[PDB]
Design a protein around this ligand. Structure first.
Ligand SMILES: Nc1ncnc2c1ncn2[C@@H]1O[C@H](CSCC[C@H](N)C(=O)O)[C@@H](O)[C@H]1O
Length: 260
């Protein structure tokens, strides 16, 4: 399955030529290809950073500052997750009177899911990070876009996930959590992604209805089936999944709930 139908980049892909004409810091990172078209080297982190900062500024009015030494997100791909969560929670069929409350697990230096969700929909976020650099940058990025009344960035300890974040300080009910990557013997090892999502499932079995939906965007096709099986085993009553992509960058979205 392709881009989300409501993704703005579905039928308006980024125009490199337009962006080069308007943004001189972006222009210094593009070149002309064989076809005579403005292009970008997607293996150069400086160029990828410029594209991402430029798109956020152009299409969302967001100014962000991010390091070369931490993950640089790809904006069109992230929007698919935002629109999917919108579908999960019934966002299209409600109005502004309903405030929504999300958790972004491992928000990254860009704090991108909360910035997009707060900007587009006025959603609140608790945004967690274990990494010091990512935490600091995420926090500057929220503050420089004046979104700290909607987005609370928190450094959490290394070993913790959802439960340790949600105590007497917490909101009673959250609408969703979000999470994406990175995360002789016959038996294959679980690997990083499968282990990590299983920690989310484990916390969800304690929290139950304190969140309306648990979700995670998977980077590996092979994660999906064993995650579904673990959910079946545990009696989780409502499971849904789908797929999204931006060119070759593929994702498998999985969400579950303890509500009927
Ligand atoms: N248990 C945990 N709690 C919070 N953040 C975590 C975590 N384990 C890993 N992370 C963070 O998860 C991130 C990688 S996965 C999420 C990527 C993020 N949405 C982005 O766009 O950058 C890293 O920033 C890492 O520091």
């Amino acid at each position: 399955k392709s881009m989300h139908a409501r993704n703005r980049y579905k039928d308006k892909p980024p125009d490199f030529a337009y962006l080069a004409s308007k943004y001189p810091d972006f222009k210094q990172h593009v070149q002309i290809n064989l076809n005579g078209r403005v292009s970008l080297n997607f293996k150069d982190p400086e160029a990828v950073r410029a594209l991402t900062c430029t798109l956020l500024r152009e299409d969302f009015g967001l100014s962000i500052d991010i390091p070369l030494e931490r993950l640089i997100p790809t904006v069109p791909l992230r929007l698919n997750y935002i629109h999917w969560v919108e579908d999960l929670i019934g966002h299209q069929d409600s109005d502004k009177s309903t405030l929504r409350r999300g958790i972004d697990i491992g928000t990254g230096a860009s704090c991108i899911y909360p910035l997009l969700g707060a900007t587009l929909n006025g959603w609140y976020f608790l945004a967690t990070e274990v990494d010091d650099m990512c935490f600091n940058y995420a926090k500057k990025n929220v503050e420089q876009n004046n979104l700290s009344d909607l987005i609370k960035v928190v450094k959490v300890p290394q070993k913790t996930l959802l439960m340790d974040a949600l105590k007497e300080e917490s909101e009673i009910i959250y609408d969703f959590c979000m999470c994406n990557p990175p995360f002789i013997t016959e038996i294959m090892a679980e690997g990083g992604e499968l282990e990590f999502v299983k920690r989310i499932i484990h916390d969800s079995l304690q929290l139950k209805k304190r969140l309306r939906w648990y979700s995670c965007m998977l980077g590996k096709k092979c994660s999906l089936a064993p995650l579904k099986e673990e959910l079946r085993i545990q009696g989780v009553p409502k499971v849904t999944y789908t797929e999204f992509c931006q060119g070759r960058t593929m994702r498998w979205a999985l969400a579950w709930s303890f509500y009927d």
